[PDB]
Subunit: 280 residues, 3 copies
């Protein structure tokens, strides 16, 4: 029975040591920790990027604006946040767990964190003075607090999100524009549930499908529709206006998320920025 004791240890560990052979080990065989350290990218290694002074944790001031050290999302989110050629002025994204966030003009603003049932839900900042109005035919996503941009009316305790778009192709000189809007209660608010989709079926997407079909086949562009998964929200579109719905946003108006692309073809870039901005 003592043979069982020794032969049992063969299960616990491997006689093999780490090395180049670990790369060439056949796929069917099992692995030890040392080899798995080599083969797969370790969570330590990503944590090792910002590690200084061999501290147990990375610097607090760094963890604030790096999504608590999630470097992978931080890199891609950073460029789309600002520096894109086609984005007008500076896209405004209020990331959670932050002291300051830039506004449309570019001044960093102390963020008013809204607390829901003793839990911080989201924060907003003053819009500031927009550099320029949104000129060309492009799409954009807008999220504001206690305000409706189309109606210019304030609803206390309610968050309204607007999506604007240009149906016509940028090359096509014909001008057709529409938008989708909805108001969400403060309580059941989750950034994850909202997205811009071209495949998932929703009421906004249905409107865009036939609305583009209204235009000539040469100038058609694939529909991009607002989708909201949260209970208690109704998405309302608009008829084909043919003129841009929103040109500028007042500074006094509270702001949560706002991003517009000069051309419509890079509409999906907006959704990517929204996806990266808030962790689910």
């Amino acid at each position: 029975e003592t043979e069982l004791r020794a032969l049992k240890k063969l299960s616990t560990t491997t006689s093999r040591v780490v090395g180049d052979s670990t790369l060439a080990l056949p796929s069917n065989v099992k692995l030890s920790k040392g080899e798995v350290e080599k083969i797969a990218v370790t969570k330590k290694e990503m944590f090792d990027e910002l590690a200084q002074c061999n501290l147990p944790t990375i610097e607090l001031i760094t963890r604030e604006h790096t999504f608590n050290g999630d470097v992978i999302r931080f890199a891609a989110w950073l460029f789309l946040m600002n520096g894109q050629k086609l984005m007008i002025a500076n896209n405004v994204a209020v990331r959670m767990g932050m002291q300051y966030a830039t506004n449309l003009a570019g001044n960093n603003v102390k963020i008013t964190y809204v607390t829901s049932n003793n839990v911080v839900k989201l924060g907003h900042i003053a819009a500031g003075v927009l550099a320029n109005p949104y000129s060309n035919k492009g799409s954009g996503l807008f999220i504001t607090y206690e305000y409706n941009l189309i109606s210019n009316l304030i609803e206390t305790g309610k968050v309204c999100v607007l999506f604007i778009t240009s149906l016509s192709t940028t090359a096509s000189s014909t001008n057709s524009f529409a938008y989708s809007t909805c108001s969400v209660p403060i309580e059941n608010w989750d950034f994850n549930m909202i997205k811009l989709t071209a495949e998932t079926s929703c009421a906004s997407l249905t409107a865009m499908t036939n609305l583009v079909n209204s235009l000539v086949p040469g100038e058609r562009t694939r529909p991009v529709g607002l989708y909201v998964d949260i209970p208690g929200v109704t998405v309302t579109t608009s008829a084909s206006s043919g003129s841009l719905p929103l040109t500028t946003i007042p500074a006094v108006t509270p702001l949560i998320f706002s991003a517009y692309t000069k051309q419509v073809e890079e509409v999906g870039v907006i959704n990517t920025l929204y996806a990266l901005s808030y962790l689910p």
Copy 2:
């Protein structure tokens, strides 16, 4: 009877649960899935960045231009594509699987996806009007369809790869430049094979190495040579020019890949952008 049964499962799975000690387990020890789910960053976690509404897959429109979710790749490729300080005008990279791609001027246009044997291989777009001609001691890589920038002669069923370079350093006011053009058939085309190398031996590097020797000893620069692994390729490197072989690209000229840097000293980033752009 049951002693074999239990002892097999005893070895087969792990009794230990995940925790802090999971990090401190011996390297030679073997591990469970929950342990590996902690130690290494997962496919899901990388996939989790773009996940919305807990959907099985990422959004289609985001899936198109993010290399089908290669967020690790997408971030680095993005800045080199747009916003490089030394890059002139807008370098053009045509990403596969996408409807639109920006041209030199910055106006995004529809892509003509070439299909070979009922299988797509590459896409090209109109060059557009260049913002400014390339005027400095710099190097660039150029890929065009059905055309030869050296001879300005149209091709049929042929894709020509051109690589200009700056023999002198930035400080060396002495002016001398060379190039290495190649033409490849569509049938044998494969992006991954071609690269810019300073160590791998090739015909272009063979000439390029001696060319800097013609320079004064103080003026030497590290050779950078075009290398093509595609069988049936012809590589030609002309003598020193003393002037820029190419100044501007005609708008009607078809384009696939084009990028140039004012300073030759950053020629390496050109290869990186080409490496990032196309998945092997």
Copy 3:
């Protein structure tokens, strides 16, 4: 006897083919290489980003300025290094194992690699002509070789690190500015040790926290203090000057690391850039 050899294989090999089932296998269940090949993003895949022509290793020139393939390290570091707004002129960071590095004006220059006891400790370059004076009410980190920026005196065989800051908030019109300085020998030099912290206790932080506390309510800002882990280090923090200590630096003055943000609120990006720039 045969059972022992037979049952050993059951230990070493899972005998289960990879698939979606492997994705859904229980966490307690042990797994083979094929699962870890799937479950975790491999070191191979990160190598695959720059992989080309199926070469056993990545290109030399590409690996030189990409931290030898640390793509994610290269990604986030790239945008912060240059191209971001709220950065005066160009941030200058000299990466190790490099031929050229950009100056303040943006022209890349040869790097004098300082080798100590037959080990290359660091490298420095000529500062070049600064584009503009260092704006207003911002913070920055400065590292110079054989020099003292505040004292403008040469110290052979000693490297000095300087930190500047603005106590007052950008919104507050009141003006209060302080700084921290240290002189480090080259022999004990190690990049990873030094950092900007808001939680770790250090002499520089202790001097600064009461200083901003001396400011009236509503004007106080989170203290960010120099912390140096290298033994034999002195840190000095003067009284609140009320005016910017430094505006421009001479071109002839050697420069190791230099970064400055127009707004103080983005102090973290300064530490973030330093953390990314040099591997531990």
